[PDB]
């Protein structure tokens, strides 16, 4: 069924090279060669996790016939109230080697062995504020011991955690911030999203003045909402046999937000 094929697509995910994303990739590269640690901050729906993920994938791990994989970038995400053991365990799994059973000092010794030899240039920690305050001792330790850049990614709260300790604030003083959509940038996005993500047969033509008012109020500049809203509108719309997104169905969706 043609309709079923299309609904499954719309329910999925994709990466669109937005203006905000291009900047981060170049900034991190600077930091990568310079081998310096830094942090990235911004509001929770700005798409920080995605920009950082897209980056990870542009540097495929490499493999020769003999030695272990060389893995320039490591991306991990902690659990809530992450302890010192939990951080090493995830780094070790990420790199495909598993050590089971021992004490904290053993996970640490083993983490430094897999981080060495195997080239690692950058470690990215998502939701950095899930880290328990003491774990930063182990994050600094690695950052200073090995020539590995460490990047901390998070919301404004992350800085509230960092500013409570001078030892950390100073290693991670440099920062980049993500912002929101506005003005001409919000409009250009909307148009890209229509052609690049929705793809209905009949042009729904949203950049029109009358329609942008609806979207602006509904989304308030967060790329997160903009995506959810236009996808929910094409899916609802197709389920009812329409060939485009109109004004009333868009309002029907926006009303629920």
């Amino acid at each position: 069924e043609w309709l079923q094929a299309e609904i499954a697509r719309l329910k999925g995910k994709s990466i669109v090279p937005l203006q905000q994303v291009k900047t981060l990739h170049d900034w991190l590269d600077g930091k990568r060669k310079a081998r310096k640690s830094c942090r990235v901050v911004g509001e929770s729906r700005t798409g920080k996790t995605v920009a950082c993920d897209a980056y990870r994938y542009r540097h495929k791990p490499q493999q020769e016939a003999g030695r272990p994989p060389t893995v320039p970038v490591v991306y991990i995400r902690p659990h809530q109230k992450c302890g010192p053991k939990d951080l090493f365990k995830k780094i070790t799994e990420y790199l495909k080697y598993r050590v089971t059973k021992g004490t904290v000092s053993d996970f640490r010794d083993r983490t430094i062995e897999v981080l060495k030899g195997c080239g690692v240039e950058m470690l990215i920690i998502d939701e950095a504020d899930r880290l328990k305050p003491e774990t930063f001792a182990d994050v600094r330790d690695i950052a200073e011991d090995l020539g590995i850049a460490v990047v901390l990614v998070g919301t404004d709260r992350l800085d509230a955690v960092i500013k409570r300790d001078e030892q950390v604030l100073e290693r991670f003083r440099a920062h980049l911030r993500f912002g929101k959509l506005s003005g001409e940038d919000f409009k250009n996005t909307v148009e890209m999203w229509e052609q690049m993500v929705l793809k209905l047969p009949v042009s729904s033509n949203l950049k029109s003045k009358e329609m942008l008012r609806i979207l602006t109020s509904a989304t308030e500049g967060y790329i997160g909402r903009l995506d959810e809203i236009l996808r929910e509108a094409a899916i609802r719309s197709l389920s009812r046999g329409l060939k485009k997104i109109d004004k009333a169905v868009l309002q029907e969706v926006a009303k629920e937000y």
Binding site: G12, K13, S14, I15, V16, P17, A54, Y57, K60, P61, Q62, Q63, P69, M196
Partner: peptide, 14 residues
């Protein structure tokens, strides 16, 4: 411009 599918990157992964 190139645009990527989200699962594709995983299918082509190192």
């Amino acid at each position: 411009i190139e645009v990527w599918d989200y699962e594709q990157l995983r299918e082509e992964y190192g």
